[PDB]
């Protein structure tokens, strides 16, 4: 009942595919020879908060390493 | 068999405190073991190497045997013996200020803690006696530390001088 | 509306006012100085600041730990010796650090200034991360190295040999056990200040030099934070300089103190550097010397003085015990080698062309021995033959001083040669200096520590290593060993069939 | 120079072929995992049991540990460094506890350090956003200078209660808890100053001072009962354990959670003040936190133990109703503050379902945990006897 | 095996050893700075700015360019790669504009990041601590659910009006400042459904699915011409410039500011609601971080451009007013939410009290810095119109 409980990115982005509406303006502003499906799904599932985190925890080995080791 | 952590000696303890049942047997055991098994002035060093862990196993009998028999209010104040242990640190304390040397002083302590060392004595009580006596024990001989030279150092210990070399 | 914020020192500045005065509010540890309740201190921290400078230097740690290092092959492209080493270096230093956190809240107690609460308090959490850090060090040789073994049990394996005995009297009892401003002695103004900030330093030296880049990215950041904890020693002089009592007892706590720490650091540190590596940095009686007499007890020491802190009385004397001191020791430390949870090495060609040109007259001495030795076959496990023998068939037994716990043999030194022994109450004491002597004397009650004879006695070799898991993971070969080739490796049967069983060198002068 | 005169061992040629010339054809041993022989909580081992677990040199004499013989040094008189005689309560290996949230030191201030960069970028924020214009200028100069303020010294001296107990806790992972959960505790005390501190910044007529919620600390009337129960749990408590538990399982539990989940956290926005709860939502977090710790502590660990699981909950239980005293009378007294509040800010019927919600958690996180008889009904009447 | 069967020059000795033979003695430059030629905008060069001005391979022929010649491959019709032609305004160098916060990738992420993480600590707290209880049905189930709902298509529009943007902007720096600030909108987005999704494992029966507030958004009337100008400001807008300012500048000054600070962090509070407010503190944040990189963007540099100054600032003025009425028109339809309140919630004096506070920062802000004759009664005044 009053388990610590949160949510991720999979259960947020679950519903994204939703967040555009239809209007008759919306379109693409670019020319173009072809017309891609309202309806496609993408691989991975990431929210902004997370897409930040897994480059963020990328940018601590990368630096930490080159700051301090390899400049040793 | 013989070992560091297990042996025939140690078995030999479990199951003779095994056999205690009762607050005030295995309450005065545990004040004895100490008076043949620890501190400098012990009875005997004939179980150095176990009692130790022999002492822990008496006290872990003598408090579940205390929790069982006293009540409330007198697990918090009394002595597994019955004394009141506020007298008791206040009495101890007293004697304390009231020692002429670091020896008399030293003997004070070493005593008390032989006597009231929990589960005798609630904690409390005998941590709060251990900051008052160990503050005066030390104001004593920590006092002109490196006057008495060796030689007489020894003597006034009173340790058996068994050999001597020094180029 | 311009963005505004709060900073630490903002904070800080009125962290002094969180205490209160009443009735109870003192100290629950037994001590004979007051520490002044209007005592500042060095750094304005907050808990968060603190977590956030930390946390900097953390991510640089670990991410060269984790990515270019593992990537070189850091943790094995390392030499033999060394290796071996660090099993010693780290797990010996983290119980330094593990009691230094308990040491650092008996002090927080003790201080009754907010201020100089809270910056025990920020030594408390220190150490903390040094525990870990030093732990980290030993799990990553066990993970990535050429010899887990050691390195993956130091905290249970480290029990079986008496080298271990020493380092928990300075850097464990000696942290904590005591008049609170002794163990703050003994653990900031001589420990810190005088051996470790510098030792810290010169380990991340010494594992350059022999391949190892694992180390030097660990201890370098532990380094960051020692100057604030050395600035808590200072502090700690300074909230007691009033108190009359103080001129009364301070200088005996600190003569005591840096006698305590020096008596193991000595033989010890030289020991392990000089004959733990391959490649050499600095001799260690130079080292020594600008250690202990000039930076500490000269300069260090010299900035106290208007607190009234004289240098240690026991100084000189410490200088004229220390020259041979950590070859003496090795010789009792190899003889022993199967009581270890490393593999030791004995002297090649060209180390002992670098002794006998620092040491001269090493070669006389400790080179022939080690020859005599290896030439029986101490590598060879078929031989039947480890140098334990060779003391007591030339009757030169080992003792463990009291006090200090340290291993000497006053029949072989060529250091220190002088032996005290005593009986009180049906038991025997040894010892090795007039301090130590003093100490017991006076103290009884407090060096009551059996040795590993005493433990021992009347046991076999062999059971006393097994008993307390000293093998590798196949239960049969033996972690420690006599040499760092790769084969021929000692057994447990190699061992057994020695048939060595300990005695209490004490009852013979009965 | 270019180059540097230092030689590394790893990079130079002629000391890598040494190093290289040495090394053995494979590892001397398989078993490449540190403390290998600690037993695993969970399905495998964790960094943090690796790195944390028998630290401390205990010989076999202190329930678990792995090491023998004596200590080599003692307290003058023959003190132990650390005994069993610290504690009254008993265990068969004070190495059992493990913190849930599996903290060392490196996780605890990764987070703690990511929670100060935020509180810095959310009062550039609020100052920037101009939201103080919003707050009511009573419940500001009034009830979180002097009251909310006065409360820091209350945590204050929660922080200090830890001092014994990081110096005779049995085993590293229980030293490690406790540590945390001081700091924590000072921590918020900060908080609350900084808060002050801010408010000074932005408000032309604040003062940052801690006389007045001192002031109200020390002589006022409506804490006086709580600042008694906290200079007792500090200084008249030298067993680590009744410390510990007494502070986090009782006192903290009941009285804390109230002053600051049902007073502030709940009257602070209805005055236009999203200010003082962005720092209680920090509080309340890192309560939550401890509380795990605590739990597998006393309960999990020592109030079960296979061995002395009677003992231990006897010795709390008695622990229990020590404490449940000097708390309510803290909890009575402070409702004198309500009289203070504005005509309508709150009536009895809330200050008395939000007692309930405080007491019955109170009762199905702690007190049945070591069953002890606690009885909902009569406490909530003790404490609002005391609304003037 | 235990060394590997790869060689690494750097570790190598054979390999090693032959290209310490081939280093000269010393640097053959000592001018060890990337970057040394960009002009500084504080003291030092800061690596914010180091690895980023100049990254864009403009040519002089857009202003600021360092390179030369036509662009190699353009688009069907000759449209350049990138262009003068893409917007109205003028300058006399595209790479003038610096983020007040200097965020490259590195920080922005670390940042973000730092907030993901102590939110999810502050949910498990929340929730573990059952604040829940304390807030009201109908807030929570109406207010809550549907219409901070539907807003969050709001900021999702605002997010995909960046989109041209990114594919148009003239120079690295401005490119790198849009694309956050777009991203910072989407965040806020699903921060709102994050909420959701939250409220719904917390309290039975609440449905996370999107159906309600998505119809509310595309049907209801509170937010109809708040939805008109959104998708206006998104799919009728071409100059990217136009966008950005328009947008930040005005739109979400106005409205967005509004219904996130004066009504739902407002409001909120007064229904038990702590739970809203906390990521309405992160927008907020977001919000004013954006808005000095805006002010850099459009106010220092184009609208102070030394040689395009008053052309900028004519132009500006235009957008400003073109967007202003559907902004009005968007808050006057909003204004009909409050009668939809339980009574005695609000006033019409504090919700015209809260409308002034909005205008006026937006023409301290904003407004005056390009000398937009505002009158702040007028615009109040075609607001309250909406008032039911
Ligand atoms: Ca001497
Ligand atoms: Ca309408
Ligand atoms: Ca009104
Ligand atoms: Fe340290
Ligand atoms: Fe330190
Ligand atoms: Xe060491
Ligand atoms: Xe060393
Ligand atoms: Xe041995
Ligand atoms: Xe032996
Ligand atoms: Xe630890």
Not at chain 2, 120 to 143: A, H, K, S
Request: hydrophobic share 40%.
């Amino acid at each position: 009942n009053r388990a610590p409980t949160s949510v991720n990115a999979q259960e947020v982005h679950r519903w994204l595919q939703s967040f555009n509406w239809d209007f008759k303006n919306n379109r693409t502003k670019y020319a173009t020879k072809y017309k891609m499906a309202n309806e496609t799904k993408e691989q991975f599932k990431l929210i902004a908060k997370e897409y930040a985190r897994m480059e963020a925890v990328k940018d601590e080995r990368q630096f930490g390493s080159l700051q301090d080791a390899l400049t040793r | 068999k013989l070992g560091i952590h297990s042996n025939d000696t140690r078995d030999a303890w479990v199951n003779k405190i095994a056999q205690l049942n009762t607050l005030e047997k295995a309450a005065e055991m545990l004040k004895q073991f100490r008076m043949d098994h620890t501190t400098p002035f012990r009875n005997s060093y004939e179980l150095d190497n176990d009692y130790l862990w022999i002492e822990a196993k008496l006290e872990e009998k003598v408090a579940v045997l205390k929790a069982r028999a006293f009540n409330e209010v007198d697990f918090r104040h009394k002595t597994a013996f019955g004394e009141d242990a506020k007298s008791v640190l206040d009495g101890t304390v007293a004697k304390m200020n009231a020692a002429k040397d670091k020896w008399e002083a030293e003997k004070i302590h070493i005593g008390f803690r032989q006597a009231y060392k929990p589960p005798i004595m609630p904690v409390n009580y005998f941590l709060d006696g251990e900051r008052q006596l160990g503050t005066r024990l030390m104001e004593l001989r920590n006092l002109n530390y490196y006057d008495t030279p060796l030689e007489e150092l020894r003597k006034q210990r009173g340790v058996r001088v068994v050999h001597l070399q020094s180029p | 509306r311009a963005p505004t914020s709060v900073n630490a020192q903002e904070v800080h500045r009125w962290l002094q006012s969180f205490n209160w005065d009443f009735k109870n509010n003192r100290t629950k540890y037994a001590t004979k100085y007051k520490m002044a309740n209007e005592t500042k201190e060095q750094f304005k921290l907050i808990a968060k600041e603190y977590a956030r400078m930390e946390a900097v230097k953390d991510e640089r740690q670990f991410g060269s730990l984790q990515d270019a290092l593992t990537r070189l092959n850091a943790g094995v492209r390392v030499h033999p010796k060394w290796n071996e080493t660090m099993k010693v270096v780290s797990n010996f230093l983290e119980v330094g650090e593990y009691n230094a956190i308990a040491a650092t809240g008996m002090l927080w107690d003790s201080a009754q200034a907010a201020e100089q609460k809270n910056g025990y308090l920020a030594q408390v959490l220190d150490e903390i991360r040094h525990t870990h850090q030093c732990a980290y060090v030993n799990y990553y040789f066990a993970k990535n190295g050429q010899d887990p073994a050691g390195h993956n049990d130091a905290r249970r394996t480290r029990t079986i040999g008496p080298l271990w005995k020493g380092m928990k009297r300075v850097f464990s009892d000696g942290f904590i056990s005591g008049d609170a401003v002794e163990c703050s002695l003994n653990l900031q103004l001589v420990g810190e200040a005088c051996f470790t900030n510098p030792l810290i330093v010169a380990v991340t030296e010494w594992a350059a030099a022999n391949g190892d880049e694992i180390t030097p990215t660990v201890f370098l950041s532990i380094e960051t934070d020692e100057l604030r904890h050395m600035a808590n020693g200072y502090q700690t002089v300074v909230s007691i300089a009033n108190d009359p009592a103080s001129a009364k007892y301070l200088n005996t706590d600190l003569n005591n103190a840096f006698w305590t720490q020096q008596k193991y650091f000595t033989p010890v540190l030289g020991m392990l550097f000089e004959y733990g590596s391959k490649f050499k940095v600095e001799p260690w009686v130079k080292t020594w010397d600008r250690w202990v007499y000039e930076d500490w007890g000269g300069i260090w020491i010299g900035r106290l003085g208007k607190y009234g802190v004289e240098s240690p009385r026991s100084l000189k004397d410490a200088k004229q015990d220390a020259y041979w001191a950590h070859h003496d020791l090795y010789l009792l430390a190899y003889a022993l080698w199967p009581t270890g949870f490393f593999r030791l090495a004995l002297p090649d060609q060209e180390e002992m062309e670098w002794f006998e040109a620092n040491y001269p007259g090493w070669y006389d001495h400790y080179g022939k021995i080690y020859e005599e030795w290896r030439a029986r076959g101490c590598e060879d496990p078929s031989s039947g033959f480890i140098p334990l023998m060779w003391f007591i068939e030339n009757n030169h037994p080992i003792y463990i001083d009291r006090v200090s716990q340290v291993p000497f043999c006053p029949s072989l030194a060529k250091g220190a040669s002088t032996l005290r022994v005593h009986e009180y109450n049906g038991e025997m004491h040894t010892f090795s200096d007039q301090w130590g002597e003093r100490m017991w004397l006076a103290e009884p009650e407090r060096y009551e520590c059996q040795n590993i004879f005493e433990q021992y006695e009347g046991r076999e070799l062999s059971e006393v290593i097994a008993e307390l898991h000293g093998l590798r993971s196949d239960g049969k070969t033996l972690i420690a060993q006599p040499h760092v080739r790769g084969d021929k490796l000692w057994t447990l049967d190699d061992i057994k069939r020695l048939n060595c069983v300990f005695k209490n060198p004490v009852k013979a002068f009965n | 120079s270019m180059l540097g005169e230092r030689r590394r061992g790893l990079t130079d040629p002629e000391m890598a072929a040494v190093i290289l010339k040495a090394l053995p054809e494979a590892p001397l041993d398989g078993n490449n995992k540190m403390g290998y022989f600690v037993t695993p909580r969970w399905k495998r081992l964790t960094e943090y049991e690796a790195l944390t677990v028998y630290a401390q040199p205990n010989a076999d004499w202190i329930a678990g540990g792995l090491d023998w013989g004596d200590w080599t040094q003692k307290f003058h008189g023959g003190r132990p460094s650390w005994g069993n005689e610290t504690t009254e309560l008993r265990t068969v290996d004070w190495f059992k506890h493990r913190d849930p949230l599996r903290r060392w030191h490196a996780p605890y201030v990764k987070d703690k350090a990511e929670e100060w960069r935020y509180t810095d970028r959310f009062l550039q924020g609020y100052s920037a956003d101009g939201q103080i214009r919003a707050m009511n200028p009573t419940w500001r100069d009034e009830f979180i200078n002097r009251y909310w303020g006065a409360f820091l010294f209350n945590e204050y001296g929660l922080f200090n209660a830890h001092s014994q107990g990081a110096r005779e806790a049995l085993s590293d992972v229980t030293r490690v808890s406790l540590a945390f959960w001081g700091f924590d505790k000072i921590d918020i005390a900060q908080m609350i100053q900084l808060e002050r501190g801010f408010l000074a910044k932005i408000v032309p007529g604040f003062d940052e001072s801690t006389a007045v919620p001192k002031a109200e600390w020390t002589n006022g009337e409506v804490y006086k009962s709580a600042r008694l129960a906290v200079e007792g749990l500090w200084q008249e408590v030298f067993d680590w354990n009744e410390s510990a538990f007494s502070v986090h399982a009782v006192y903290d539990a009941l009285f804390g959670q109230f002053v600051r989940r049902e007073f502030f956290q709940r009257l602070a926005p209805r005055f236009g003040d999203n200010l003082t709860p962005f720092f209680i939502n920090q509080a309340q977090t890192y309560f939550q936190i401890a509380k795990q710790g605590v739990q597998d502590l006393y309960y999990n660990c020592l109030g079960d133990d296979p061995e002395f699981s009677d003992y231990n909950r006897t010795v709390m239980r008695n622990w229990t109703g020590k404490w449940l005293e000097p708390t309510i009378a803290a909890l009575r007294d402070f409702m004198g503050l309500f009289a203070k509040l504005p005509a309508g800010t709150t009536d009895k019927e809330e200050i008395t379902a939000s007692l309930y919600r405080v007491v019955d958690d109170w009762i199905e996180d702690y007190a049945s945990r070591i069953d002890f008889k606690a009885d909902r009904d009569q406490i909530v009447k003790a404490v609002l006897a005391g609304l003037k």
